[PDB]
């Protein structure tokens, strides 16, 4: 009985906490969504109602988002520099090895979620998703759970799982979300982590369900898809470049920096204001399809009907409010053809999107990118339709094309072909399986050969302590050997040395693991000793050895001339905590994680 209970406990306990976390995440997503939604509705109502006078309308359009943005900023600013505007990259860094304790603290939670919510409410004017922040939150929760329960590896795994769950929840999409997270965040992942993530996602889905009460492709087609993917990749590279440079400029340019220092919220507010005017429906949004929710846009993009043909058949009417059945009517204009409108959107979102990303607040930057990709895809589809009105020898459905574009562009941006999978999941259909995937792959090829990932770019801009190789990031990763960053301080307990001396040493340092040396002159290692054990022995060094104190031999030895990178890799893979260094056999020093972290920091920031 007791034995059975014991057996049940560890594994079961592990499962249970994860499940709980998942549930919590689901709850957060539901509640957050609800909070967003009502606000959005209210805003819409206000827009409808305030009147026909222009100024008032403008104010309604412009003020509400601005205020929200400001609110988001303010909460972020008060706690710590690395709180707001950071999720995935930070997580990645953590996974790589270097720990930033500021990131996992729970005092930060309440201020960030609210900000995220505000951002969401602000919506399609500001044009930002929720992913990264959500992921961060999830990770934090996981960390908290771990702490409550209370090795490094296990903790890391837990964090990963949490992240996966977070990703799933935002997407409302279990199967692929976790995979995507794994692709983006980590490296040296295990299947069990993935499984855990999946489980969490499933739990979240279940929770959502529970809470529901409240509330045949041809051969040229493939070629076309590939072309689309390529185009996306091209575009994505450019986008990535822009992201890399704009952020740098912001960091750099002195006046801007000063302004930020004075008031980040002010900067954010200003940005919002700038966005808002451009958006404004009757002035310029009639061209940009402005008057639409975030999901609404996506829906419009991935619509089954082929727009150009429809337009040709009949001029669509501009309604008072956007039709729930016919979202795509927003994209049409008489003077500017649907194609033209799409082009405009592409031009303008790109211009704006980077700016939006820049502004300091809790916000996600995946969804917008996806939407952009979809738009591009749709344009291509439309073009194809125009070319071949009959179709290829079944007609060309541009929805599929749009979907492919969304999959592809995002993947290119993110260096992750899980994007395709995610897209498929969102669709609900696995009939577009190959071509889309191929397109995504193509995009990745063109993007990953030229540029770093969006996330990677962001990390570079930050100068966060992440060791691995990134494209377009000049740094001395191969040069720094162990000699430069190793700890020269050692506590050599040689056989030959007297007992009093040893005692004194013990009294002084009290290190976790003392090295055992052959003799004082040679300084050559013959294994290791633990401190507590030594103390015990003393209470009760050749003499000591004779008496019978256990010599745990050194399993693995680094040279001083070995590269930092290799060492780091070793540390990551074998799950080690410390490791001694030998030069011609001599105990020169002692590599821990701390030293490695320090080295990484140095590399990042001169």
């Amino acid at each position: 009985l007791d034995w059975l209970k014991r057996k049940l406990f560890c594994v079961g306990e592990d499962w249970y906490f994860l499940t709980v976390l998942g549930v919590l995440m689901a709850l957060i997503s539901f509640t957050m969504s609800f909070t967003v939604g009502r606000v959005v509705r209210a805003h819409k109502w206000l827009y409808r109602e305030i009147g026909d006078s222009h100024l008032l309308r403008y104010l309604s359009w412009t003020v509400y988002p601005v205020a929200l943005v400001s609110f988001s900023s303010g909460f972020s600013q008060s706690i710590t520099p690395f709180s707001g505007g950071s999720g995935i990259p930070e997580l990645k860094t953590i996974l790589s090895g270097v720990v930033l304790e500021d990131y996992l603290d729970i005092k930060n939670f309440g201020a960030k979620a609210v900000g995220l919510t505000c951002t969401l409410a602000s919506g399609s004017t500001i044009f930002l998703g929720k992913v990264g922040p959500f992921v961060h939150l999830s990770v934090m929760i996981a960390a908290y759970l771990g702490r409550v329960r209370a090795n490094k590896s296990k903790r890391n795994e837990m964090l990963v799982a949490g992240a996966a769950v977070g990703v799933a929840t935002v997407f409302a999409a279990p199967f692929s979300g976790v995979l995507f997270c794994i692709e983006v965040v980590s490296s040296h992942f295990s299947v069990w982590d993935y499984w855990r993530g999946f489980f969490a996602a499933t739990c979240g889905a279940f929770m959502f369900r529970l809470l529901a009460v409240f509330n045949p492709f041809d051969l040229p087609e493939i070629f076309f898809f590939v072309a689309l993917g390529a185009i996306c990749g091209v575009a994505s590279c450019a986008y990535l470049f822009c992201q890399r440079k704009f952020l740098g400029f912001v960091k750099t340019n002195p006046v801007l920096s000063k302004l930020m220092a004075t008031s980040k919220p002010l900067y954010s507010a200003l940005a919002a204001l700038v966005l808002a005017s451009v958006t404004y429906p009757p002035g310029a949004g009639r061209f940009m399809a402005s008057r639409l929710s975030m999901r609404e846009y996506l829906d419009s993009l991935l619509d089954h009907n082929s727009w150009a043909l429809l337009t040709r058949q009949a001029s669509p009417p501009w309604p008072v409010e956007p039709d729930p059945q016919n979202l795509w009517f927003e994209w049409y204009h008489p003077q500017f053809t649907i194609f033209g409108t799409l082009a405009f959107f592409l031009v303008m979102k790109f211009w704006m999107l980077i700016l939006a990303t820049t502004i300091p607040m809790p916000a996600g930057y995946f969804m917008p990118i996806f939407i952009f990709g979809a738009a591009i895809g749709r344009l291509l589809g439309e073009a194809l339709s125009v070319a071949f009105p009959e179709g290829i020898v079944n007609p060309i459905m541009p929805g599929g094309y749009a979907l492919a574009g969304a999959a592809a562009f995002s993947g290119a941006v993110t260096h992750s072909i899980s994007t395709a999978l995610l897209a498929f999941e969102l669709t609900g259909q696995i009939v577009h399986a190959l071509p889309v995937l191929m397109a995504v792959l193509a995009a990745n090829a063109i993007a990953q050969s030229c540029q770093p990932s969006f996330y990677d770019g962001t990390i570079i801009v930050k100068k966060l302590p992440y060791l691995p190789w990134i494209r377009g990031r000049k740094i001395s990763s191969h040069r720094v050997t162990v000699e430069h960053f190793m700890n020269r301080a050692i506590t050599t307990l040689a056989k030959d040395t007297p007992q009093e001396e040893v005692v004194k040493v013990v009294t002084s340092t009290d290190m976790a693991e003392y090295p055992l040396v052959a003799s004082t002159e040679s300084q050559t290692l013959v294994g290791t000793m633990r401190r507590a054990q030594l103390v015990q022995a003393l209470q009760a060094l050749q003499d000591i050895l004779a008496e019978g104190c256990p010599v745990e031999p050194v399993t693995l030895k680094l040279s001083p001339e070995t590269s930092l990178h290799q060492a780091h890799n070793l540390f990551e893979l074998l799950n080690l905590q410390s490791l001694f260094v030998t030069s011609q056999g001599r105990a020169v020093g002692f590599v821990s994680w701390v030293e490695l972290e320090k080295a990484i920091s140095k590399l990042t920031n001169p």
Epitope: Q313, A314, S315, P316, T337, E390
Partner: antibody
Amino acid sequence: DVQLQESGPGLVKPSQSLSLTCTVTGDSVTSDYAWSWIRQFPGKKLEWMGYITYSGNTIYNPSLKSRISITRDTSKNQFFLQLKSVIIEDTATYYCSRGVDYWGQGTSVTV
Amino acid sequence: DIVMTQSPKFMSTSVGDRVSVTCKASQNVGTNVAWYQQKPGQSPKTLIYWASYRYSGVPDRFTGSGSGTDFTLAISNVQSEDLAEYFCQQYNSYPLTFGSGTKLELK
């Protein structure tokens, strides 16, 4: 106020190619619309013929690809059919239209 | 060709009553369906270009609805001037198809 007006011969001998001139007033042919042809039988059942784009690429009903041929003159703003291999079953009242929005008054073709 | 099967074929009502003509498509059309009125002799004038969007210069009593595979034209407060045939046309797919047509007499 876009207005379409058909014109052509009513009585026709079978196995002799017919042609109908549809003139436009109020709108240019070079605009991006579906300049389409439709016909209604004596039993009051509508059948879609086809249409030309702004550029000139013609699209037809799959059932009548062989016989139908539709053209335009951009100078006069008109539409010309060249319906060949005429049969007594083809006897109908024809209708030249701008997709779905505006329709012509139509002419009664007889074989 | 995607067939547009409609019903009921014949109708006979008084002045003031409601009439509802139903159209059904074999494949999914979306909302890309237009309604016509043809009085005997004249050309068929369009009423509702997209399901539930009336044309300019048409009375409000002609209320259309539906999406996907089924659609309805609803007419309330029928007058003596509405003795006519009513067709539904789809225009999602090529070729463009039509309904057979509903003749409407009055008492």
